[PDB]
Amino acid sequence: MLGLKTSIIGRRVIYFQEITSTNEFAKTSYLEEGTVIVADKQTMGHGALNRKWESPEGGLWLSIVLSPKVPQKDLPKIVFLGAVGVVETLKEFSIDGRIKWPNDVLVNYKAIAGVLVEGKGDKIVLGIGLNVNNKVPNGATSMKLELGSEVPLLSVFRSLITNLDRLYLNFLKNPMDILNLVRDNMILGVRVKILGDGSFEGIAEDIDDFGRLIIRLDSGEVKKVIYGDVSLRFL
Amino acid sequence: MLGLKTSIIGRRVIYFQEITSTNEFAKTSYLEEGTVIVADKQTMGHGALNRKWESPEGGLWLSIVLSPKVPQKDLPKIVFLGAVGVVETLKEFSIDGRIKWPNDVLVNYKAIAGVLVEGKGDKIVLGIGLNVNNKVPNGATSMKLELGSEVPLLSVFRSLITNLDRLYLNFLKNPMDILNLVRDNMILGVRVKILGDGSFEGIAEDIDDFGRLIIRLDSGEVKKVIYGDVSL
Ligand SMILES: Nc1ncnc2c1ncn2[C@@H]1O[C@H](COP(=O)(O)OCCCCC[C@@H]2SC[C@@H]3NC(=O)N[C@@H]32)[C@@H](O)[C@H]1O
Ligand SMILES: Nc1ncnc2c1ncn2[C@@H]1O[C@H](COP(=O)(O)OCCCCC[C@@H]2SC[C@@H]3NC(=O)N[C@@H]32)[C@@H](O)[C@H]1O
């Protein structure tokens, strides 16, 4: 009854009044590529390292099952698909979303959405949490809060699914294209702190041909950051 | 993201751009009670027996998984929940639908919807096909044809699920209630022909406590129909 016209993403959609976590359900269940798992609220929503992701009613919490037939070296770029998709949808609603490498989208430096990719080769789960009309934790914001009025949740869903399907289809043909879009929509030219094995500060200059964040330390030394257990903090 | 507020029916919804048949999928897949299977289009939609149910884009084609902890004798009434639900939804949209025993809903005698219940194991599948904005077979009708304008398909879905959830919850507690709701919305007091072998005609008088159609033949003899096709 939804009348979705996408080619892959959204061929099927499983909606939940409530669920533990759409990412957990998508990873665990036997599902076809392109299936979208969406719920009004999550009781056990999570980010990386099982960090808690607040998922109250009013937000868009979903996961997409993917089976990307591209070189293994391109797989890490899936997270960018989600990030850019969100940015494009926000722009459609006239909200200025900017990407915080590699998986967050901010508005005025406040987190409005987060992306989490999990998988293992043949099966990749693209998870996206976007605050629309829901209450949010400090440090975050929502579409409603930015526009000063509530936004039809279904309209946001349709917008995002349409955008992701297009991005994904092009990704299968040209896996490098998404890097240009991330670059054009990411926060750069400012000082950032990278938290990992230790920590260092520098100017976020750009992302390279592998999606690595290029940071210039005061000393002039260039470091290339690979995401995966490293957190980025703006100063 | 649909924000459904129903108690059982609609707890989960599985949507398909395209599918063979929502009833078939519901029968062969493990799904929790209340799960709704819905698709924009069915390539192998079916009615009773070996009949095809045209299911092009624009209509509402869905199936609901139920597991009624009620006596065995009440299960034949599930089809009525579907039919009454459709009638109630049609009324919300200013359309007067009447039930043609035991599973069809007609508007001015043109079929606008059909219900098909199939029991599999101890799970019951309630299938409903309602013509909204889609093209229909000659002689049939749709909500669009009755109203003269395109009807928001999702609005019809929300309305129907809400009505069905209410009807079902009450059915679990008071299984006889549905019978009177059917009687007040069914085509009665008219001559009909019970098709098939031993075909016969008579006046459709009412439905009894089991949901059987009561027919009075011209001879004065009374027959009770459990199932079959009725022609007005
Ligand atoms: N509602 C919120 N808005 C803004 N910030 C918040 C919110 N809830 C929690 N946070 C903050 O975000 C952090 C999680 O960040 P992350 O690990 O980068 O991981 C980010 C990835 C999140 C993916 C979320 C989706 S929801 C659909 C799917 N199901 C699921 O369980 N996860 C994904 C938390 O530690 C917290 O400080
Ligand atoms: N779109 C239509 N509108 C009006 N009349 C039509 C339409 N398509 C076919 N018909 C006529 O209705 C008859 C089917 O009637 P039925 O056996 O009483 O069986 C009726 C039960 C139908 C249940 C349909 C739902 S759709 C969701 C679910 N999935 C599935 O495969 N079946 C059910 C056909 O033989 C045909 O003449």
Provide the CATH number for the domain around residue A154: 3.30.930.10
* Same-domain check for residues A183 and A194: no
**Any long-range contacts for B222-231 (C-beta under 8 Å, 24+ apart)?**
B223/B194, B225/B101, B225/B194, B226/B76, B227/B102, B228/B194, B228/B195, B228/B196, B229/B48, B229/B194, B229/B195, B229/B196, B230/B100, B230/B101, B230/B102, B230/B192, B230/B193, B230/B194, B230/B195, B230/B204, B231/B192, B231/B193, B231/B195
Q: What is the sign of the dihedral through the CA atoms of A89, A92, A94 and A97?
A: positive
Residues 6+ apart with CB under 8 A from A3: B40, B57, B153
Q: Which of A27, A38, A53 to mutate to test the pocket of ligand 1 (most atoms within 8 A of CB)?
A: A53
According to DSSP, the residues that pair with A114 across neighbouring strands are A104, A129
* Same-domain check for residues B209 and B134: no
* Same-domain check for residues A198 and A133: no
In chain B, the residue whose alpha carbon lies closest to the alpha carbon of A157 is B1
Residue position matching structure tokens 């990412």: A23
Residue A80's Cβ-side half-sphere holds a number of Cα atoms within 13 Å equal to: 26
In chain B, the residue whose alpha carbon lies closest to the alpha carbon of A11 is B17
For chains A and B, CB pairs below 8 A equal 64
Phi and psi of A64, rounded to 5°? -125, 130
Scored b (16 or more CB within 10 A) or e, B39-52 reads bbbbeebbbbeeee
Structure tokens at A109: 């430096």
The answer to whether A150 and A133 have CB atoms below 8 angstroms apart is yes
Distance between CA B22 and CA B152 in Å, rounded? 21
Distance between CA B171 and CA B182 in Å, rounded? 13
**Any long-range contacts for A198-203 (C-beta under 8 Å, 24+ apart)?**
A201/A235
Q: Is any ligand 1 atom within 6 A of the Cβ of residue A140?
A: yes
The answer to whether A9 and A161 have CB atoms below 8 angstroms apart is yes
Range of the domain at B200: 188-232
* Same-domain check for residues B144 and B215: no
Asked if the peptide bond before residue B102 counts as cis, ω within 30 degrees of 0, the response is yes
Give the number of residues written for chain A.
Answer: 235
Ligand located closest to A195 CA: 1
Residues 6+ apart with CB under 8 A from B171: B68, B70, B74, B77, B81, B177, B178
Give the number of residues written for chain B.
Answer: 232
Closest-CA residue to B115 (of B45, B178, B170): B45
Cα A163 to the center of its chain, rounded Å: 13
* Same-domain check for residues A110 and A66: yes
Distance between CA A66 and CA A68 in Å, rounded? 6
Cα B14 to the center of its chain, rounded Å: 19
The answer to whether A186 and A98 have CB atoms below 8 angstroms apart is yes
Distance between CA A174 and CA A70 in Å, rounded? 9
The answer to whether A63 and A126 have CB atoms below 8 angstroms apart is yes
Q: Is B121 left (phi over 0), alpha (psi -120 to 50) or beta?
A: left
The answer to whether B97 and B113 have CB atoms below 8 angstroms apart is yes
Strands ordered across the beta sheet of B200-207: B222-225, B213-216, B200-207, B190-194, B230-231
Determine, for residues A14 and B16 on separate chains, whether the beta-carbon distance falls below 8 Å.
Answer: no
Strands A191-195 and B104-107: unpaired
* Same-domain check for residues B149 and B227: no
The neighbour count for residue A54, using CB atoms within 10 Å, is 16
Closest-CA residue to A89 (of A32, A37, A128, A36): A128
The neighbour count for residue A174, using CB atoms within 10 Å, is 10
The answer to whether B36 and B64 have CB atoms below 8 angstroms apart is yes
Q: Is any ligand 1 atom within 6 A of the Cβ of residue A61?
A: yes
* Same-domain check for residues A158 and A218: no
Distance between CA A86 and CA A61 in Å, rounded? 12
* Same-domain check for residues A156 and A212: no
The answer to whether A65 and A32 have CB atoms below 8 angstroms apart is yes
Ligand located closest to A228 CA: 1
Q: Is any ligand 1 atom within 6 A of the Cβ of residue A21?
A: yes
Does residue A11 sit in helix, strand or coil?
Answer: coil
Reduced DSSP (H G I as helix, E B as strand, rest coil) percent helix, strand, coil of chain B, to 5: 25, 30, 45
Closest-CA residue to A184 (of A88, A77, A45, A74): A88
Considering only the beta carbons, identify the residue of B4, B12, B62 that sits closest to A14. Answer: B12
* Same-domain check for residues B161 and B200: no
End-to-end Cα, chain A, rounded Å: 47
As for how many domains chain A has, the answer is: 2
Asked if the peptide bond before residue B71 counts as cis, ω within 30 degrees of 0, the response is no
Residue position matching structure tokens 């508005």: A107
* Same-domain check for residues B168 and B195: no
Distance between CA B35 and CA B56 in Å, rounded? 22
DSSP-assigned letter for residue A134: S
* Same-domain check for residues B192 and B167: no
Strands A98-100 and A60-66: unpaired
Does residue A163 sit in helix, strand or coil?
Answer: helix
Amino acid identity for residue A14 in this structure: I
DSSP characters over B66-105? E---S-GGGGGGHHHHHHHHHHHHHHHTT---EEETTTEE
Distance between CA A108 and CA A146 in Å, rounded? 9
* Same-domain check for residues B82 and B109: yes
Closest-CA residue to A76 (of A171, A191, A195, A144): A171
Distance between CA A149 and CA B200 in Å, rounded? 64
User: Å resolution of this model?
Assistant: 1.8
Distance between CA B159 and CA B85 in Å, rounded? 9
Distance between CA B168 and CA B164 in Å, rounded? 6
